[PDB]
């Protein structure tokens, strides 16, 4: 007989559940949605298409080769969809596994989606929720960051790029949103900072809260990094859907024209 099939459904359900029900429950108790729920809420019903659903990281040291550390999808859900009938390419960080930290497969998926979008001429929307880079991955995460940065810079002025931060974002996960055209934040659940409060206390000898160090209010009222802040994930996604209608799909297109009553 052939055992390939039931393995395919096991991997499918593992990818759908991400990193188990306990991590999803922990995600929900913080007032935050999961990556796939955000994708479903952002795109038109029955229009999302996956990409690189069966990928895992190539790490082999620090015990990352064990089957307990192998998650299909690898902390990002990438694909394409339609908003109000117009094509768009989306990726969503999965904080469920490894805190959404970027690895080789993660950056490979993001780069592939960005390359496809720049080939076809469609905007890129990115929902960011990641704790930084995988330390045990090695210098591969730095290469992934650099590749993503190069693709953001190359696509700048060609296709619109939108970033929505829906959770904590530390380390190298903050330069990519800054290179995009627009940046939106979610109140009380999203953060943006180079270094955590513990490092600030260790170095500069001052106590600071994460909310008052990199919170939505700080980045929308006194630093000028983010453009808008929204009440929560559902409101943020609805406002992102409303805002996407204003922009053209590419720089080759004129300004969108809607019917006026």
């Amino acid at each position: 007989a052939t055992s390939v099939n039931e393995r395919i459904e096991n991997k499918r359900r593992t990818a759908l559940l991400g990193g188990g029900q306990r991590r999803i429950d922990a995600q929900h108790k913080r007032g935050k949605l999961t990556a796939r729920e955000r994708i479903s809420l952002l795109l038109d019903p029955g229009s999302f298409v996956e990409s690189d659903m069966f990928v895992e990281h190539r790490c082999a040291d620090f015990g990352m080769a064990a089957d307990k550390n192998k998650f299909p999808g690898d902390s990002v859900v990438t694909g394409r969809g339609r908003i109000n009938g117009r094509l768009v390419y989306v990726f969503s960080q999965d904080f469920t596994v490894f805190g959404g930290s970027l690895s080789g497969a993660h950056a490979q998926k993001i780069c592939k989606i960005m390359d496809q979008a720049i080939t076809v001429g469609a905007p890129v929307i990115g929902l960011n929720d990641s704790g930084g880079a995988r330390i045990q991955e090695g210098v591969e995460s730095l290469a992934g960051y650099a590749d993503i940065f190069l693709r953001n810079v190359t696509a700048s002025g060609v296709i619109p790029q939108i970033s929505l931060i829906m959770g904590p974002c530390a380390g190298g996960a903050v330069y990519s949103p800054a290179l995009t055209d627009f940046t939106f934040m979610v109140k009380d659940t999203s953060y943006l900072f180079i270094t955590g409060p513990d490092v600030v206390k260790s170095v500069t000898n001052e106590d600071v809260t994460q909310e008052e160090l990199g919170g939505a209010k700080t980045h929308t009222t006194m630093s000028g990094v983010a453009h808008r802040a929204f009440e929560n994930d559902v409101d943020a996604l609805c406002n992102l859907r409303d805002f996407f209608n204003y922009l053209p799909l590419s720089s080759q297109d004129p300004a969108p024209v809607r019917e006026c009553h």
Partner: protein, 247 residues
């Protein structure tokens, strides 16, 4: 000045211990033609050095980190000062040489409230869109995202070199072992293996992130030849009216 001039006094300029600083202007003087260097903004944001020099008679732009001031960390003023200079050098077909010795970005609430992310993005974009030949030399260390911001190989860089004292790592060793080994409670050995395996340019060199590990005394002769073959560099990019600088 002969192009293949040996520069032996750089063989031991970098101290063996990582807590002691040196002067990058000394290296810049030792490498460039006739040890002549026109420095731009010499009294502002001293933790970064930018200027104009000559290699084999061809004018070049020099950007480097200064471990003497602020331990070589990057901040808002240095980011802007480097970014605009790199943009000007790229705009007028001037090759760029980068010297990398940076532990990361300067932490604190003052930097976050000032918008350190935007200016770091400015510098990263400035090195990212450059189409002029770029030669990079890592002297002591390049930690974290700063390693990407300092004209790494993955930003369409041309040639990347690392001295034997280079350290291309994700972050500091102590933080790495504290984030990897949480409940191991046996960090005494973990320090030994981590330092022996990852506190060196070997992880970057084993996967082609740096072209070669060169002796410092051959730095100048290594650069000039590259500038001889990269003078005809020509690449193409997607059409646009302009891009969106993260100003």
């Amino acid at each position: 000045d002969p192009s293949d001039r040996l520069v032996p006094e750089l063989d031991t300029i970098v101290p063996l211990e990582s807590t002691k600083a040196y002067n990058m202007v000394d290296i810049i003087h030792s490498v460039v033609d006739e040890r002549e260097f026109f420095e731009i903004m010499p009294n502002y944001a001293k933790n970064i050095i930018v200027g104009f020099a000559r290699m084999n008679g061809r004018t070049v732009g020099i950007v480097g980190n200064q471990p003497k001031v602020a331990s070589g960390c990057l901040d808002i003023n240095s980011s802007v000062k480097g970014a605009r200079f790199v943009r000007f050098c790229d705009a007028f077909n001037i090759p760029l040489i980068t010297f990398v010795d940076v532990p990361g970005f300067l932490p604190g609430t003052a930097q976050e409230y000032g918008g350190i992310i935007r200016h770091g993005a400015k510098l990263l974009y400035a090195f990212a869109e450059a189409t002029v030949p770029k030669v990079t030399v890592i002297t002591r260390k390049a930690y974290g995202g700063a390693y990407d911001v300092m004209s790494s190989k993955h930003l369409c860089g041309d040639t990347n070199y690392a001295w034997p004292t280079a350290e291309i790592a994700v972050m500091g060793a102590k933080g790495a072992v504290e984030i990897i080994f949480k409940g191991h409670e046996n960090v005494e050995a973990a320090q030994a293996e981590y330092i022996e395996k990852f506190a060196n340019p070997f992880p970057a060199a084993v996967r082609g992130f740096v072209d070669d590990i060169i002796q410092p005394s051959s730095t100048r002769a290594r650069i000039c030849c590259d500038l001889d073959v990269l003078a005809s560099k020509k690449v193409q990019r997607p059409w646009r009216k302009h891009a969106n600088i993260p100003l």
